[PDB]
Design a binder for these strands. Structure first.
Length: 140
RNA sequence: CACUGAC
RNA sequence: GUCAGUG
């Protein structure tokens, strides 16, 4: 059969770097950042834990901390991940006003032309102890 | 994560 | 954000 899927799918926001023992788990109704780029019904997706480790010949690896990128529901022409699907490094997040349906309309952007916004949480929502904001410090 | 160069 | 390389 054929292999090699040229799928980019860049996140409009940053990721979530974890520095602890646990992975990531958001409560029902939380986990959705301030997506000013999407509509209220688009406030539903999942987090994907990715890593960037350069594979060198000598063995030199850049080594980057595990970060969970924010992906909207239906991000990928051949993702095959319905709301609720349990996958490694994949957690679903939904809020009030979001409907169950793929919305790949916001799951596309040129990463080498358009940057991403710092993933921030709304009022009454704080990040779990162990995670930090990528590109933002609590005070600076 | 630390440092540089680039879109 | 993303690519190349090094610490």
């Amino acid at each position: 059969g054929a292999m090699g899927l040229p799928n980019n799918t860049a996140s409009w926001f940053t990721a979530l770097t974890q520095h602890g023992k646990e992975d990531l788990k958001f409560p029902r109704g939380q986990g959705v950042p301030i997506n000013t780029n999407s509509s209220p019904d688009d406030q539903i997706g999942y987090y994907r834990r990715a890593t960037r480790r350069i594979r060198g010949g000598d063995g030199k690896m850049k080594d980057l901390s595990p970060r969970w990128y924010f992906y909207y529901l239906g991000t990928g022409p051949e993702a095959g991940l319905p709301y609720g699907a349990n996958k490694d490094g994949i957690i679903w997040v939904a809020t009030e006003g979001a409907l169950n349906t793929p919305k790949d309309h916001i799951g596309t952007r040129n990463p080498a032309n358009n940057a991403a916004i710092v993933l921030q949480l709304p009022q009454g929502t704080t990040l779990p102890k162990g995670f930090y904001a990528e590109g933002s410090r609590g005070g600076s």
